[PDB]
Design a protein around this ligand. Structure first.
Ligand SMILES: Nc1ncnc2c1ncn2[C@@H]1O[C@H](COP(=O)(O)CP(=O)(O)O)[C@@H](O)[C@H]1O
Ligand SMILES: [Mg+2]
Ligand SMILES: [Mg+2]
Length: 233
């Protein structure tokens, strides 16, 4: 059956075997769940400090690269730049904070992002009740959850040298999931994807992002870059 030309659908290659991703669901530690509901459902002045908290966590993870090289010098051989990228996507209403820090293992995600108690949680909720500024959250050891000031859902994609790539996700409500992530390999580090609330889209705007970086995050110690999607004609 001679052919001289085939159509695209004919020479489309058969799919790669379907990947299985294992998913685990966990309850937040009880006081972390209470804090998340307080953060989500209360009006605060000064919500913009969420970005300072996430940049601080990236900066901590980057500092760990430098020090882990003292017990494991092979990290010196990585050609990856130590940096942070901020990536607003107006199409999808997401703000992503990307770093090339150490990343998290699966058990790091489960323990550090929601199942282990933090000793400051109860004191912080009392300080908030008593009218403290939400900015105080970092000093109480619970800064990550500031993401929920502006995001309705948070997805964390991460890769640590000692484990495979994982995705953590929570829309609050008391639980989170951790699953293996067989999609786009992101390389060592962490991506925090903020699915912004509808009234918090200012944090997609170039000027607003630059304003709050300059106000709150001037001593990162690593390059930070803002990716701005070109406005279409
Ligand atoms: N970008 C990132 N890279 C690596 N680990 C991160 C991270 N963001 C958060 N984490 C992990 O999440 C933990 C909780 O962060 P918090 O900001 O809530 C409290 P703290 O440990 O920074 O004082 C961090 O200790 C770290 O283990
Ligand atoms: Mg922190
Ligand atoms: Mg520092």
């Amino acid at each position: 059956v001679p052919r001289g030309s085939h159509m695209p659908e004919e020479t489309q290659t058969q799919d790669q075997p379907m990947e299985e991703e294992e998913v685990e669901t966990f309850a937040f530690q009880a006081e972390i769940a209470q804090l998340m509901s307080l953060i989500i459902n209360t009006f605060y002045s000064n919500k913009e400090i969420f970005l300072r908290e996430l940049i601080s966590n990236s900066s901590d993870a980057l500092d760990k690269i430098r020090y882990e090289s003292l017990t494991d010098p092979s990290k010196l051989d990585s050609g990856k730049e130590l940096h942070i990228n901020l990536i607003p996507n107006k199409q999808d209403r997401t703000l992503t904070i990307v770093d090339t820090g150490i990343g998290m293992t699966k058990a790091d995600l489960i323990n550090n992002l929601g199942t282990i108690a933090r000793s400051g949680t109860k004191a912080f909720m009392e300080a908030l009740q008593a009218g403290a500024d939400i900015s105080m959250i970092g000093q109480f050891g619970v800064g990550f959850y500031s993401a929920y000031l502006v995001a309705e859902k948070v997805t964390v994609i991460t890769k640590h040298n000692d484990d495979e790539q994982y995705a953590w996700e929570s829309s609050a409500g008391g639980s989170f999931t951790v699953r293996t992530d067989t999609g786009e390999p992101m390389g060592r580090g962490t991506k925090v994807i903020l699915h912004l609330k509808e009234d918090q889209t200012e944090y997609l705007e170039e000027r607003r992002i630059k304003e709050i970086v300059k106000k709150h995050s001037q001593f990162i110690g690593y390059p930070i870059t803002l990716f701005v999607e070109k406005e279409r004609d």
